[PDB]
Structure formats: C-alpha cells, structure tokens
C-alpha cells in the first residue's frame, strides 16, 4: 500500500519498518515494560504516561492502577 504510493511522489522514498510501538515515541519492549507496569492508560487517539513529577494526588487521580 505504501509501495504503490511511491509512484505519486517525485524524488525517492523509503519504507522503513519502525521499531517503535505504533504512533508512539518508545520501542516495542520499552512499551511492554511500561504496560504491565501502570504508566500506560488510554486517551482518545493516544496514550498518557506517568511521571515521577507533579503532585502525588494527581498521580493518584489519574493512573490509579499504579501504586499497588
């Protein structure tokens, strides 16, 4: 589907299999260890992540499967 889309473009284009998980900025095993752990939770289009920063009450309000 992307190889046919090359013909519509001038120049030269590559089909790079990314090592990230989907549309994220972290790799497939890095996304996994964040997934059994509780730093991953759904949004509309994307996923929100947990930090060691900010108020502890907001780290409890959102993301409550963590701290177990």
């Amino acid at each position: 589907g992307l190889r046919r889309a090359r013909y519509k473009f001038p120049g030269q284009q590559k089909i790079i299999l990314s090592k990230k998980w989907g549309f994220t900025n972290l790799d497939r095993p890095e996304y996994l260890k964040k997934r059994e752990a509780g730093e991953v939770k759904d949004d509309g289009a994307f996923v929100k992540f947990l930090s060691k920063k900010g108020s502890l009450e907001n780290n409890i309000r959102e993301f409550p499967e963590y701290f177990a």
Partner: protein, 292 residues
C-alpha cells in the same frame, strides 16, 4: 484563578521592595542619583517614616552594595528627654526632627556652628550658610510613600531639622497654617503645633464635652496628671534637653545577641532535606494508595 504554567513562566516580578509596597523606585532614583561631576559625593537624604507607635528618622546616603545610615533617631528614646507620651503626634515629629539634626552635627563636628533657630516661633526659616565657614549639611527630605498634605507630620521633622541646624530645602506650604485663599503661612497657628497646641486644645474641649472619651483617650494622662496646658513646657523641657545632649545613648541589650539568637532559634521551622522528603513521599504512597 488558574495561574497557568505559561503565565508563571512569562511573569516578570517587581523588584522586592516594590513587591513589598515599601519603596517607590520612581522617587528613589530621583532622590539618590548624584550629578556625575560630583563624582563620589554622597547625596544625603532625610528618611522620615511614621509607623504606628513609633517615628523613625534617619540620615542616609547610598552605595552600590546598599544604603548607609549616617545618623539615626527614634521617637522611642524621647522618654529620656522627658517626652513619655505623644510619640506619634505632630510635635514628636518635630522632637525627633530636632534630635536627628543635633545628633548629626555633633557627629560631624558642626554642632557649635549652625545652632539653627534657637527659640522656636514657627517662622519659615532656612539654614543660611556661615560666611567663610563650612557650608551647612545639605540633606533632602524623603517622605517615602506618605502623601504630601498640608499639615502632615512628615513635614513635622521638616520644620524640626530646619530649625535644628540642617539645611533641608523646602517650601512652607505643607505646614499647618497655609491657606489656599491667601498664599501665606500662619506663624501663630504653626507655633502651637510644634509645642503640642493641637493636642492641648483637644483636652480642654474634651474637658467640656464628656469625661467618657477623656477617660478612654488620655487614660495614661489621667494616671500621672499632666495638665492640659502643661504640654508646651514639656516640649521645651525636651527641646532644651536635645541641644544639651543629643549624643545617642545606646540601650542595655539585656540577654545579649548570642543568647537572643538561641532564644529565637527554637521557634523557627526547619526546612527538610532530601532524605526525609523522599521518606515522606515513600510514606505517602503507602498512605494514599496502600489499598485502603
């Protein structure tokens, strides 16, 4: 509400003493900035601040590291001059203004020259230079954040130190006695305020109105029976005592500064360290999310 992260990042704070409401820097610059061909010549100003239950009066020049106090006076040392009450009236402002003049001139050695106006009349008089002597000690009035109003006590020390022998440049039109109708000072009315006339007449009409308010107000005065008319001789008993001895007696210091410190170092809260702030957050996880 909602002072956002983008709001706080872009906020420029006022200095510290604009943020404390304690300094007009618009006025401070114009008071302090010396003519550049008068290179290191210190430009002196008379700080006259009025708090509740005190008058604070200072002689100050400026350095880059901070301001420098040459001579300071307070109205809370007027007890030893014979003024035990009325320490924030119009006339203790004269009394502190007279003292800071005479304390500075003996400090600088110019006390025998420039005695000022000796017997006080409330004539608008300015300290004239002694011919072929040193010029008088030029000091400008800093009223600070207080308002220029006709009859204000901040202009009490202005008459206090002008007659005390300091060259303080002024007009007279903020003394009690100016008229918007006739552009002329009233020296007879102003003669009263220096010697506590505006306080003394209030007793004599509270003598004739009610003893109720005369028992609330002047309750100290009832206890040690200073006469309602005897104020003018109280102030003259202090105006003589100032020129006799303005030399700044210090006080006792009464459980001194090394043990004043440990007396006030046991009620101040201690800022923590990382090793317990981590321990508190490590506690707070088991406290907030320890599965109830």
């Amino acid at each position: 509400d909602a002072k956002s992260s983008a709001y706080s990042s872009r906020f420029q704070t006022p200095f510290r003493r604009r943020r404390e409401g304690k300094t007009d820097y618009y006025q401070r610059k114009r008071l302090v900035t010396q003519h550049k061909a008068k290179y290191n010549t210190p430009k002196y100003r008379l700080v006259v601040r009025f708090t509740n239950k005190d008058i604070i009066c200072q002689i100050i020049s400026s350095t880059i590291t901070g301001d420098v106090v040459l001579a300071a006076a307070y109205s809370h040392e007027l007890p030893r001059y014979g003024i035990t009450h009325g320490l924030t009236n119009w006339a203790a402002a004269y009394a502190t203004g007279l003292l800071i003049a005479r304390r500075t001139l003996q400090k600088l050695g110019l006390d025998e020259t420039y005695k000022g106006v000796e017997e006080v009349e409330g004539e608008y008089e300015l300290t004239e230079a002694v011919e072929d002597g040193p010029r008088p000690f030029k000091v400008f009035l800093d009223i600070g954040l207080q308002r220029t109003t006709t009859g204000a006590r901040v202009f009490g020390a202005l008459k206090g130190a002008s007659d005390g022998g300091l060259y303080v440049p002024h007009s007279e039109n903020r003394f009690p006695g100016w008229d918007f109708e006739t552009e002329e000072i009233d020296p007879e009315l102003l003669r009263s305020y220096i010697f506590g006339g505006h306080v003394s007449q209030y007793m004599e009409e509270l003598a004739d109105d009610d003893e109720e308010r005369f028992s609330e107000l002047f309750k100290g005065y009832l206890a040690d029976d200073i006469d309602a008319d005897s104020l003018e001789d109280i102030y003259t008993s202090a105006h003589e005592a100032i020129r006799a001895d303005p030399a700044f007696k210090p006080t006792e210091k009464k459980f001194t500064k090394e043990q004043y410190a440990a007396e006030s170092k046991k009620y101040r809260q201690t800022k923590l360290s990382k090793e317990e702030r981590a321990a508190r957050v490590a506690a707070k996880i088991a406290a907030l999310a320890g599965q109830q």
